[PDB]
Every structure is written in structure tokens, then in C-alpha cells.
Amino acid sequence: TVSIQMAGNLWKVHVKAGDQIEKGQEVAILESMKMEIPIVADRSGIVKEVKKKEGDFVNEGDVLLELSNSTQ
């Protein structure tokens, strides 16, 4: 999994299931603190699933996406 790390609203999301991410690649944007903050892949992988959408509420530790198992 990869998760949000602050309270806010998930401004936009750029992944989809079957997409590729790499550690530090942009994955979403979070709006909070009257600012916008990029959200990145904490690790590389294929996006197995996405758990959020644009404009949804999000929190510190709230899941953003899930990735391929190491066997893949």
C-alpha cells in the first residue's frame, strides 16, 4: 500500500489500476493548510488498485493505493 500522510482533501489523483509507479514519482496532490502538496509513490510497483479519488477526504495514514505482490 501507499497512503496519505496529512489531513486534507485529495485535490487530484493521477494513477489508475495497471499503471506503473516508481519511488518519488508523483501519484496525487493533497489540498490542506490553504496550500496544495504533491503526493508521491513511497515505493515502485504496478498499481494493483486505487483506494481514493479526486476531491475525497483524506487523513494521516489513510490509504491511497495498493501495489503488485513481489511475485509479479
Q: Is 45 left (phi over 0), alpha (psi -120 to 50) or beta?
A: left
Task: Print the domain residue range for 63.
Answer: 1-72
DSSP of 3-31: E--SSEEEEEE---TT-EE-TT-EEEEEE
What is the rounded distance in angstroms from the CA atom of residue 37 to the CA atom of residue 47?
Answer: 21
Lookup result for grid cell 494521516: 60
Phi and psi for 66 in degrees, rounded to 5?
-130, 150
DSSP 57: E
Nearest to 39 by CA among 9, 69, 18: 9
Nearest to 4 by CA among 45, 52, 48: 52
Q: How was this structure determined?
A: NMR
The answer to whether 14 and 2 have CB atoms below 8 angstroms apart is: no
Domain total for the chain? 1
CATH number for position 59: 2.40.50.100
